[PDB]
Design a protein around this ligand. Structure first.
Ligand code: MET
Length: 186
């Protein structure tokens, strides 16, 4: 059980769609990551040689999911901005070597405040790291050095503040659904 979530992207005729099993952190989404082989990444490749090079470098490295906690994570800013549906604010779309086309939409929403892979990528590239879950003693999480990986009560999540994990999961899934922008999967 998770959700597909659809973002519009400024100056791009298609949409971006992401799967996650953690809609509860969705207010903490500070950027999107697409596979090198993804249509948006290659529409952008057209006016970007750094990305052309990166895409070719990736086409060589057969990155396997199980080998990923090991590999140097790498990526490039596509230039495209996506609009966060709940928030209204623009977030960068990056191409990343750790996102694949084979399984999934070839795109992922990232919450570096609460997923460690996400935290390492954002640390390395200067992307925003947003706390939305509280530590288990109900303090603000320490995000000076690593991601707070625990499930917990949301904060700094607007209308969703105060909700525990299961309540957040449903309240944010239901909202994205009522906005016709999200879909539960079984
Ligand atoms: C911060 S936990 C959720 C983030 C992760 N990228 C996911 O889509 O599940």
């Amino acid at each position: 059980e998770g959700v597909e979530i659809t973002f519009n992207v400024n100056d791009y005729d298609n949409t971006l769609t992401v799967y996650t099993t953690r809609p509860d952190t969705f207010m903490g989404c500070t950027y999107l990551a697409v596979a090198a082989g993804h249509p948006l990444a290659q529409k952008a490749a057209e006016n970007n040689p750094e990305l052309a090079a990166f895409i070719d470098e990736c086409r060589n490295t057969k990155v396997a999911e199980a080998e990923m906690a090991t590999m140097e994570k790498k990526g490039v800013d596509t230039g495209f901005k996506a609009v966060h549906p709940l928030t209204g604010e623009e977030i960068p779309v990056w191409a990343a070597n750790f996102v694949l086309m084979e399984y999934g939409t070839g795109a992922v929403m990232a919450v570096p405040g609460h997923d460690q892979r996400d935290y390492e990528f954002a640390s390395k590239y200067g992307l925003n790291i947003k706390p939305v879950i509280l530590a288990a003693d109900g303090s603000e999480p320490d995000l000076s050095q690593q991601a707070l990986t625990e499930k917990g009560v949301l904060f700094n999540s607007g209308e969703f503040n105060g909700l525990d994990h299961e309540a957040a999961f449903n309240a944010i899934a239901d909202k994205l659904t009522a906005m016709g922008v999200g879909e539960r999967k079984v």
